[PDB]
């Protein structure tokens, strides 16, 4: 009798089921027109400049997603990155505005340009698991106005869970703590971030990426439990797009 | 007082006989595969209809082509095609002379019996929910073709009542198993020199570029986790020159 | 025997070594006051950034940085503020903002351990520093009326030894990648990252405390900073973790 | 369709969020006080260490650390002393040290931007908290009394769920490397490294500032620190580089 | 009414029990020769044959090519007193095909040794069961394997989902272990893996003792190679001259 | 202005660079003996091969951490009928369990090289190699007259060249999966373990810097496992 | 025609010349004896206990090389690693002499035992090259022989050398700074150290290793010009030399 080991027996697709899988899982409707426009305002640093442009955009019917003032290491000069939605006619109007303001130099449009979008996020994440996160969340809500009465029936359920620290040994909760810490660390690493702080029950992460990616990280790291988050607005700096000599000289 | 006890493992040791008995037993088999596959490299002038003309010729003569990929060099009106064939030297050489005679081609080189760098690209979406879920997910799409219901209930109920199926696991343990599987796959693709380009709630996408014999081994190791979606290229190559030391090349004993 | 010149590295004397350490001393930072940090917990409503910034502008508050950060909580934001002044002035500034309807509370991070950080993106030329000295003058000539002294100095610059107009194509190429390498290793020592590489420039990315950011830009300055963009300042509080043996501070009683 | 249970993790609201953030605010600053760092440049004469340490001991000075270290210069030594007290007392200490004739001068790196470094080497168990809790009790009853006391402690620590004696050797083997990986991640993150790996323990080294080096030992404390060896603090002044657009306020 | 979090309750040493543990936990030299030999036909059997005829207790003998035409260097490791090793050195040096044999014992050298090992990714129970099979005496051993295949964490007593997770857990443990040492993982299979390590003989032997519980299926240790390094010390240490 | 390849000139360069068959139809035969560690087993395995005229390239006795058991990875050339003959000769020896044939198996070949490489440039190495050559003549002044020779450079240079060379050697060593284990004032020692042909490539690339000492040893072998997917495993018949 | 190349082939060794170099470069066995001894004192923290032990070693003429007080994470317990050279007879006398002290528990002898030796060094290294370093050195060497400025002729030949920054364009001294910096960085990376500070002129390296590697490293960075240096005494923490199941089976009687 040779040393026995159970065959896992991994099932394999056929051409039919494989197609139906790709067909079904592929985002066929995709999304509605999401396209956002970005602007780069070059303003002069005067005692009252931020309130002007930010207030001017508010004076009109403009929806502003983000607006950040960036110092450019030049005396009395600031670069402002504005993110807004709408259509080309409305955006150009907003771009034609602000530029007319005298403390500004120019308002460039990077919407149809190849740029580098970068936000900065810093978040403290719990290492005590999901059960503790529900416990902590319900606690800061049941203090006042969590309905029309108490929530002790809900609290008792969360603390009745299997993987709640109150039901686990000190050695087991320690390993799950470092297991979670590593899981967060590996997510942060793949996204190209850092772990700048490690405490007894939490850790602080730091990540710089485009809004598309920097929010995808927050979704993947959400189940661990975000205790405190801070996400900056979008910074923009146009890169220099390069194409090979063969693909270049496309004079036609 | 006694010292804190420890259950001694005492890992058993080999002896001279059982060790040799193990090595001999674990021996594979020589020449389990026939003659090594042949790799051809076409230098084709980039004019409209070349892909249909070349590939159409091989199909019109019944040549067992394993893979054919056209690569765009950084030269105007010049493309490179890498073809993989099977068969005797006499049949494959004829295939070379048949393609090279075509008008829009410059020359068809034979890369077999030559030191080359074979490369291939694969991108695969891998499930993080585990083995049990993959059995459920795959069998679910099979019922869209099998047109069976009452008979398949014996299978799906058997699967969903397994221990490590997500339905039977708490939400906190499924989360850990997702990242445990993720860390396993990530460590697995890193050893192969690959990347993890996408991470989701339920799956991840790995990217790897290596020789076919390397990728197939990779896709076999990742297979138990459950490959939801795969894209594997043909095969391209670039000739290598085997360097030898001045002492080794000085051995010109051609007497 | 095959000869090689002894470089003969001289050693310090006990007095000469002490003399240098003292001469290179000090660079003291006995500042009149630190940089006070405030953190406003703010409800999201139309024209709320104009309110906080406007209130600080209406009064004689010398603020340095004001950046609004978004939490993953619906209708909730953070405003990390950095300003100058004394304890009495800024505490009054804290109560000024806190009385505003949209805000919930304004915390003070001045006397607390926080993680100061700001993002910075810079475009740096890979060509010589003399090329940057030429490019600098060219855009200034496009500002100040008339060339005049421009043609007198541009001749002095363009005749320097390591100007890309006085070197073969292979030399400048090897100089661009050498400059590129020197920059990449600078942004590697710092927690940075090179995100773009052009034919005559490159873009670096760095996120750290304003101390390192200011230090980093000072180091890449000689190469020639074409563009720059520094964030305000973000902050997250951290609690100083002390050992169990260091609970003797509790035994101090 | 496959089941797959949901992970409806609760979301913060405006009220509960600001309530938690406010709750996590300190006093702040009740204890202790600011530390002073001094740097002595002394002649390497026989008995200098006895002079300086003896001087600070004879006086009413509470020194935290004192580190002698060579400087690759003949008969020249450098010492880094960490003080405790008001600025007046510290300066009084500095002058009394400098007044000694084997020392050239004594610098004050307190208000200066310096690089603080301290070395640590600790052997950390891999058998978990239960075994470490057992290990301490065995060595404590070997110095306290020869009687068979604390019977309901050794019996309580043992027969615990994750004590090695209650696990198969397979799990203990994995737990060793599981703990090892956790510790290794701490060291790699803190900028340290593992220099030794035994069957039931490992030795890690770490060179960082005193504040950072203490936070590390607190994180690796629950794993069980068998031996430890924290160096004293070394200090070297750096050259701070503010940007070129600072100009002047007045 | 705040979320319950059980304290670790981690105990701490006192001054007495600490030093008590330190006291309790407180506890021949090899000779290395390097022969410079002209690569004559059948010279390995000439040197090794000499060491056997004279009755020496040599540990290793690895022949290395110096990348020079008709020149090889042999690193020989042997134990014994300083007197008997000099005899072994002189005995070899007298051989015609050898140039000179150097004594690398009293010198700071870089001792190296290559090891390739195949380690099972399955549990230690499977390894304990696998050895019994190849050792198989099938009469009384039928009861022994019963005590083995009964144990949990044996692949036969676990779902394939967990076994798969155990394979990679052990794999990551071996990988993290071989990464601390100057090693690497070369081959990964669905049952085992192959590691490669090169360091001083003490490190290899230490590494194999650590990877031992996982169950080493197949191993291969090279002889000890040696290459002398020159110890560098500072100028103030170089100036420390005594008459 | 950087020039570009022509559609025709590109093809010409490819076929011109494409190497002629620089290898025999025969291949690298690898035999792995499983021997009993008896006194004098090494001398008789070698003796049997040497007395019958077999072109062996290496031997390498390897311990297997099993009591009184060793294994030898023998590499030789010749026809299949000759190698099989050489195999049967060794296996017939009574302290030999079996001699496995790896000449047609997926194996992992490993040589281990340690070499001290000079950092003082090609000029100094050319001088040093000529100095030690004179044993058992106007070139010594011709070499020491060349540019970039240490004696013809300032003290600030050479130091800057030594580390430049050090960086080059390190980058070569890193790419091949090796490491620099020692850094002398005028040289450095590298350590590399890989395929014998990969070692030969490394010792050729690092050759111009000057190889002071070298130790290549021999090749070790351990069988790999050809894993293929479930759709390539179902490619039977 | 054909594309030319400057050289044909690199020269090779022969069996006679190869063994000639190996025998010649093989180190002379001078330091066969003369080993150092490592002691570890488990001491109770009494007021002025350091000056008590160090005073004992000095008063009895013991040749100690380093004495470092390490703090354990235990109340009132500190260990001291004493490194001293001498013969076995004298060292044991030193050990027994120290151990006889009241505040010490016991003194262990880590000599002939597998321990982890570790020193910590922080050094400031110039990036301006060799010429500038012997200029800066001679500058603070003016403490002696300042009569009639006799150092002028010694200074003159220094500042008139090719790669002295005063004779180089500022564009080249920049690349020379970073080239030197990368030579130091790739050097300290090899030893397991790290560069923690980079400035306009110099940089600070940090390396923790056994005293042998520390000294070897300082000998390699010495030519670049070490401005400041600080290396602590070694710390000692014994390890456990493991050996395989067939290695430990050397139970021969
Ligand atoms: N679910 C995700 N959403 C967004 N980003 C992800 C996700 N998963 C991983 N990433 C990050 O995306 C990175 C891969 O992007 P990559 O480096 O290849 O740039 P890219 O090819 O230009 O992609 P894109 O064209 O979308 O910008 C991963 O290394 C990882 O850091
Ligand atoms: N089961 C496997 N089959 C094939 N390749 C594997 C397998 N497991 C791992 N690999 C990959 O092979 C790599 C090792 O290949 P290696 O670096 O030795 O190339 P090599 O020296 O040229 O040898 P070979 O000629 O066999 O490819 C591993 O790092 C890993 O990335
Ligand atoms: N000239 C410089 N000025 C400021 N920071 C620098 C300079 N050069 C390098 N750095 C950065 O300082 C970092 C070292 O700081 P470290 O990681 O040791 O934190 P630290 O021990 O708390 O010291 P600090 O108080 O200065 O922050 C380097 O990794 C490097 O990125
Ligand atoms: N000149 C360049 N052109 C294109 N890509 C570059 C260039 N220089 C660097 N890169 C690559 O871009 C990478 C950084 O972009 P990354 O993909 O990581 O973020 P991203 O925001 O997703 O980029 P993008 O939005 O342009 O797709 C670099 O790591 C580098 O590999
Ligand atoms: N709980 C902790 N306490 C102290 N340091 C930690 C802690 N957790 C992590 N670290 C370390 O802090 C480091 C991050 O600090 P960093 O290198 O950025 O210096 P910094 O920007 O000057 O901040 P700081 O002033 O706190 O030193 C991480 O490398 C991390 O290893
Ligand atoms: N139990 C062990 N036995 C031997 N070597 C180990 C062990 N554990 C780890 N190692 C390896 O030893 C390495 C540390 O070696 P190190 O750099 O300190 O050399 P060293 O300073 O000369 O000290 P030593 O004399 O002990 O070799 C670890 O990085 C690790 O790779
Ligand atoms: N000239 C040198 N002197 C001392 N150490 C050096 C020198 N050059 C490099 N090193 C460092 O020594 C390291 C090699 O140490 P290694 O890992 O081989 O430990 P080891 O096997 O115990 O060697 P040893 O017995 O000599 O201590 C190099 O990686 C490098 O970091
Ligand atoms: Mg810091
Ligand atoms: Mg070592
Ligand atoms: Mg390969």
PDB file of C-alpha atoms in Angstrom, chain A residues 17-179:
ATOM      1  CA  UNK A  17     -19.086  26.694 -20.772  1.00  0.00           C
ATOM      2  CA  UNK A  18     -15.873  28.704 -21.114  1.00  0.00           C
ATOM      3  CA  UNK A  19     -17.549  31.065 -23.577  1.00  0.00           C
ATOM      4  CA  UNK A  20     -20.688  31.406 -21.446  1.00  0.00           C
ATOM      5  CA  UNK A  21     -18.412  32.249 -18.517  1.00  0.00           C
ATOM      6  CA  UNK A  22     -16.532  34.955 -20.416  1.00  0.00           C
ATOM      7  CA  UNK A  23     -19.781  36.243 -21.938  1.00  0.00           C
ATOM      8  CA  UNK A  24     -21.528  36.481 -18.563  1.00  0.00           C
ATOM      9  CA  UNK A  25     -18.632  37.882 -16.531  1.00  0.00           C
ATOM     10  CA  UNK A  26     -17.652  40.485 -19.137  1.00  0.00           C
ATOM     11  CA  UNK A  27     -19.111  43.910 -18.241  1.00  0.00           C
ATOM     12  CA  UNK A  28     -21.298  44.105 -21.357  1.00  0.00           C
ATOM     13  CA  UNK A  29     -23.139  47.328 -20.495  1.00  0.00           C
ATOM     14  CA  UNK A  30     -19.882  48.727 -19.071  1.00  0.00           C
ATOM     15  CA  UNK A  31     -20.708  52.174 -17.676  1.00  0.00           C
ATOM     16  CA  UNK A  32     -22.544  55.360 -18.622  1.00  0.00           C
ATOM     17  CA  UNK A  33     -20.328  58.249 -19.875  1.00  0.00           C
ATOM     18  CA  UNK A  34     -18.062  58.839 -16.870  1.00  0.00           C
ATOM     19  CA  UNK A  35     -15.409  60.956 -18.628  1.00  0.00           C
ATOM     20  CA  UNK A  36     -14.135  63.785 -16.434  1.00  0.00           C
ATOM     21  CA  UNK A  37     -12.214  66.899 -17.460  1.00  0.00           C
ATOM     22  CA  UNK A  38      -9.056  68.153 -15.762  1.00  0.00           C
ATOM     23  CA  UNK A  39      -7.650  71.687 -15.723  1.00  0.00           C
ATOM     24  CA  UNK A  40      -4.315  73.185 -14.684  1.00  0.00           C
ATOM     25  CA  UNK A  41      -4.572  76.741 -13.365  1.00  0.00           C
ATOM     26  CA  UNK A  42      -1.344  78.727 -13.065  1.00  0.00           C
ATOM     27  CA  UNK A  43      -2.093  81.487 -10.559  1.00  0.00           C
ATOM     28  CA  UNK A  44      -0.096  84.128  -8.692  1.00  0.00           C
ATOM     29  CA  UNK A  45       0.099  83.694  -4.923  1.00  0.00           C
ATOM     30  CA  UNK A  46      -1.747  86.749  -3.600  1.00  0.00           C
ATOM     31  CA  UNK A  47      -3.379  87.289  -0.137  1.00  0.00           C
ATOM     32  CA  UNK A  48      -6.739  86.238  -1.607  1.00  0.00           C
ATOM     33  CA  UNK A  49      -6.412  83.926  -4.602  1.00  0.00           C
ATOM     34  CA  UNK A  50      -7.816  80.559  -3.490  1.00  0.00           C
ATOM     35  CA  UNK A  51     -11.166  82.082  -2.538  1.00  0.00           C
ATOM     36  CA  UNK A  52     -11.462  83.672  -5.988  1.00  0.00           C
ATOM     37  CA  UNK A  53     -11.227  80.682  -8.333  1.00  0.00           C
ATOM     38  CA  UNK A  54     -12.919  78.297  -5.888  1.00  0.00           C
ATOM     39  CA  UNK A  55     -15.630  80.880  -5.270  1.00  0.00           C
ATOM     40  CA  UNK A  56     -16.022  81.748  -8.944  1.00  0.00           C
ATOM     41  CA  UNK A  57     -16.651  78.108  -9.856  1.00  0.00           C
ATOM     42  CA  UNK A  58     -19.211  77.954  -7.048  1.00  0.00           C
ATOM     43  CA  UNK A  59     -20.860  81.157  -8.268  1.00  0.00           C
ATOM     44  CA  UNK A  60     -21.645  79.298 -11.487  1.00  0.00           C
ATOM     45  CA  UNK A  61     -23.355  75.923 -11.847  1.00  0.00           C
ATOM     46  CA  UNK A  62     -20.116  73.941 -11.937  1.00  0.00           C
ATOM     47  CA  UNK A  63     -19.721  70.546 -10.273  1.00  0.00           C
ATOM     48  CA  UNK A  64     -16.173  70.338  -8.923  1.00  0.00           C
ATOM     49  CA  UNK A  65     -14.865  66.910  -7.923  1.00  0.00           C
ATOM     50  CA  UNK A  66     -11.512  68.099  -6.571  1.00  0.00           C
ATOM     51  CA  UNK A  67      -9.343  71.217  -6.355  1.00  0.00           C
ATOM     52  CA  UNK A  68      -5.809  71.254  -4.955  1.00  0.00           C
ATOM     53  CA  UNK A  69      -3.228  74.044  -4.787  1.00  0.00           C
ATOM     54  CA  UNK A  70       0.327  72.952  -5.570  1.00  0.00           C
ATOM     55  CA  UNK A  71       3.428  75.029  -4.865  1.00  0.00           C
ATOM     56  CA  UNK A  72       5.918  74.949  -7.737  1.00  0.00           C
ATOM     57  CA  UNK A  73       9.080  76.039  -5.887  1.00  0.00           C
ATOM     58  CA  UNK A  74       8.783  79.413  -7.624  1.00  0.00           C
ATOM     59  CA  UNK A  75       8.241  82.652  -5.695  1.00  0.00           C
ATOM     60  CA  UNK A  76       4.580  83.724  -5.767  1.00  0.00           C
ATOM     61  CA  UNK A  77       3.452  81.038  -8.219  1.00  0.00           C
ATOM     62  CA  UNK A  78       0.974  78.206  -7.678  1.00  0.00           C
ATOM     63  CA  UNK A  79      -0.394  75.384  -9.830  1.00  0.00           C
ATOM     64  CA  UNK A  80      -4.038  74.437  -9.285  1.00  0.00           C
ATOM     65  CA  UNK A  81      -5.509  71.150 -10.503  1.00  0.00           C
ATOM     66  CA  UNK A  82      -9.275  71.210 -11.030  1.00  0.00           C
ATOM     67  CA  UNK A  83     -11.381  68.120 -11.742  1.00  0.00           C
ATOM     68  CA  UNK A  84     -14.901  68.588 -13.111  1.00  0.00           C
ATOM     69  CA  UNK A  85     -17.534  66.801 -15.200  1.00  0.00           C
ATOM     70  CA  UNK A  86     -19.860  67.837 -18.016  1.00  0.00           C
ATOM     71  CA  UNK A  87     -19.379  68.324 -21.749  1.00  0.00           C
ATOM     72  CA  UNK A  88     -16.713  70.148 -23.774  1.00  0.00           C
ATOM     73  CA  UNK A  89     -18.909  73.219 -24.223  1.00  0.00           C
ATOM     74  CA  UNK A  90     -19.467  73.681 -20.497  1.00  0.00           C
ATOM     75  CA  UNK A  91     -15.894  72.832 -19.488  1.00  0.00           C
ATOM     76  CA  UNK A  92     -14.370  75.264 -21.991  1.00  0.00           C
ATOM     77  CA  UNK A  93     -16.636  77.953 -20.535  1.00  0.00           C
ATOM     78  CA  UNK A  94     -15.191  77.208 -17.102  1.00  0.00           C
ATOM     79  CA  UNK A  95     -11.732  77.187 -18.670  1.00  0.00           C
ATOM     80  CA  UNK A  96     -12.451  80.474 -20.436  1.00  0.00           C
ATOM     81  CA  UNK A  97     -13.499  81.710 -17.010  1.00  0.00           C
ATOM     82  CA  UNK A  98     -10.861  81.793 -14.230  1.00  0.00           C
ATOM     83  CA  UNK A  99      -8.270  82.618 -16.910  1.00  0.00           C
ATOM     84  CA  UNK A 100      -9.875  86.060 -17.154  1.00  0.00           C
ATOM     85  CA  UNK A 101      -9.112  86.564 -13.460  1.00  0.00           C
ATOM     86  CA  UNK A 102      -6.080  88.826 -13.123  1.00  0.00           C
ATOM     87  CA  UNK A 103      -4.081  86.900 -10.545  1.00  0.00           C
ATOM     88  CA  UNK A 104      -3.878  83.903 -12.894  1.00  0.00           C
ATOM     89  CA  UNK A 105      -1.518  83.394 -15.836  1.00  0.00           C
ATOM     90  CA  UNK A 106      -3.092  80.559 -17.814  1.00  0.00           C
ATOM     91  CA  UNK A 107      -5.575  77.697 -17.539  1.00  0.00           C
ATOM     92  CA  UNK A 108      -4.416  74.648 -19.496  1.00  0.00           C
ATOM     93  CA  UNK A 109      -6.652  71.726 -20.466  1.00  0.00           C
ATOM     94  CA  UNK A 110      -5.166  68.274 -19.861  1.00  0.00           C
ATOM     95  CA  UNK A 111      -8.384  66.365 -20.579  1.00  0.00           C
ATOM     96  CA  UNK A 112      -7.251  65.195 -24.017  1.00  0.00           C
ATOM     97  CA  UNK A 113      -3.583  65.052 -23.012  1.00  0.00           C
ATOM     98  CA  UNK A 114      -1.448  62.193 -21.694  1.00  0.00           C
ATOM     99  CA  UNK A 115      -0.914  63.015 -18.020  1.00  0.00           C
ATOM    100  CA  UNK A 116       0.056  61.419 -14.711  1.00  0.00           C
ATOM    101  CA  UNK A 117      -2.747  61.413 -12.142  1.00  0.00           C
ATOM    102  CA  UNK A 118      -1.574  61.071  -8.537  1.00  0.00           C
ATOM    103  CA  UNK A 119      -3.503  61.162  -5.266  1.00  0.00           C
ATOM    104  CA  UNK A 120      -2.161  60.544  -1.763  1.00  0.00           C
ATOM    105  CA  UNK A 121      -4.030  58.413   0.763  1.00  0.00           C
ATOM    106  CA  UNK A 122      -3.201  57.636   4.391  1.00  0.00           C
ATOM    107  CA  UNK A 123      -5.343  55.224   6.391  1.00  0.00           C
ATOM    108  CA  UNK A 124      -5.272  53.468   9.757  1.00  0.00           C
ATOM    109  CA  UNK A 125      -6.526  49.901   9.406  1.00  0.00           C
ATOM    110  CA  UNK A 126      -7.610  47.526  12.177  1.00  0.00           C
ATOM    111  CA  UNK A 127      -5.789  44.209  12.579  1.00  0.00           C
ATOM    112  CA  UNK A 128      -8.412  42.710  14.892  1.00  0.00           C
ATOM    113  CA  UNK A 129     -10.593  41.454  12.044  1.00  0.00           C
ATOM    114  CA  UNK A 130     -14.133  41.980  10.786  1.00  0.00           C
ATOM    115  CA  UNK A 131     -16.001  41.060  13.974  1.00  0.00           C
ATOM    116  CA  UNK A 132     -14.201  43.704  16.031  1.00  0.00           C
ATOM    117  CA  UNK A 133     -14.945  46.266  13.318  1.00  0.00           C
ATOM    118  CA  UNK A 134     -18.697  45.675  13.577  1.00  0.00           C
ATOM    119  CA  UNK A 135     -18.380  45.942  17.355  1.00  0.00           C
ATOM    120  CA  UNK A 136     -16.492  49.234  17.122  1.00  0.00           C
ATOM    121  CA  UNK A 137     -18.813  50.672  14.466  1.00  0.00           C
ATOM    122  CA  UNK A 138     -21.996  49.871  16.371  1.00  0.00           C
ATOM    123  CA  UNK A 139     -20.439  51.306  19.536  1.00  0.00           C
ATOM    124  CA  UNK A 140     -19.930  54.812  18.136  1.00  0.00           C
ATOM    125  CA  UNK A 141     -23.504  54.805  16.837  1.00  0.00           C
ATOM    126  CA  UNK A 142     -25.416  53.275  19.754  1.00  0.00           C
ATOM    127  CA  UNK A 143     -24.169  56.055  22.037  1.00  0.00           C
ATOM    128  CA  UNK A 144     -26.897  58.346  20.694  1.00  0.00           C
ATOM    129  CA  UNK A 145     -29.500  57.997  17.921  1.00  0.00           C
ATOM    130  CA  UNK A 146     -29.038  54.487  16.535  1.00  0.00           C
ATOM    131  CA  UNK A 147     -32.776  54.153  16.001  1.00  0.00           C
ATOM    132  CA  UNK A 148     -35.518  54.574  18.593  1.00  0.00           C
ATOM    133  CA  UNK A 149     -33.959  52.348  21.254  1.00  0.00           C
ATOM    134  CA  UNK A 150     -30.798  50.464  22.217  1.00  0.00           C
ATOM    135  CA  UNK A 151     -28.962  47.864  20.138  1.00  0.00           C
ATOM    136  CA  UNK A 152     -27.852  45.388  22.808  1.00  0.00           C
ATOM    137  CA  UNK A 153     -29.461  42.583  20.809  1.00  0.00           C
ATOM    138  CA  UNK A 154     -27.188  43.436  17.880  1.00  0.00           C
ATOM    139  CA  UNK A 155     -24.102  43.875  20.070  1.00  0.00           C
ATOM    140  CA  UNK A 156     -24.552  40.449  21.662  1.00  0.00           C
ATOM    141  CA  UNK A 157     -24.703  38.856  18.206  1.00  0.00           C
ATOM    142  CA  UNK A 158     -21.412  40.379  17.052  1.00  0.00           C
ATOM    143  CA  UNK A 159     -19.648  39.251  20.229  1.00  0.00           C
ATOM    144  CA  UNK A 160     -21.198  35.805  19.782  1.00  0.00           C
ATOM    145  CA  UNK A 161     -19.230  35.288  16.562  1.00  0.00           C
ATOM    146  CA  UNK A 162     -16.480  32.676  16.297  1.00  0.00           C
ATOM    147  CA  UNK A 163     -13.595  34.874  15.151  1.00  0.00           C
ATOM    148  CA  UNK A 164     -14.253  37.672  17.628  1.00  0.00           C
ATOM    149  CA  UNK A 165     -11.223  38.389  19.890  1.00  0.00           C
ATOM    150  CA  UNK A 166     -13.364  37.859  23.005  1.00  0.00           C
ATOM    151  CA  UNK A 167     -13.829  34.216  21.985  1.00  0.00           C
ATOM    152  CA  UNK A 168     -10.238  33.593  20.894  1.00  0.00           C
ATOM    153  CA  UNK A 169      -7.093  32.881  22.961  1.00  0.00           C
ATOM    154  CA  UNK A 170      -4.411  35.569  23.285  1.00  0.00           C
ATOM    155  CA  UNK A 171      -2.100  33.483  21.102  1.00  0.00           C
ATOM    156  CA  UNK A 172      -4.683  32.962  18.364  1.00  0.00           C
ATOM    157  CA  UNK A 173      -5.724  36.614  18.162  1.00  0.00           C
ATOM    158  CA  UNK A 174      -2.023  37.509  17.960  1.00  0.00           C
ATOM    159  CA  UNK A 175      -1.445  35.333  14.899  1.00  0.00           C
ATOM    160  CA  UNK A 176      -4.625  36.544  13.194  1.00  0.00           C
ATOM    161  CA  UNK A 177      -3.417  40.068  13.939  1.00  0.00           C
ATOM    162  CA  UNK A 178      -0.144  39.473  12.100  1.00  0.00           C
ATOM    163  CA  UNK A 179      -1.923  37.408   9.458  1.00  0.00           C
TER     164      UNK A 179
END
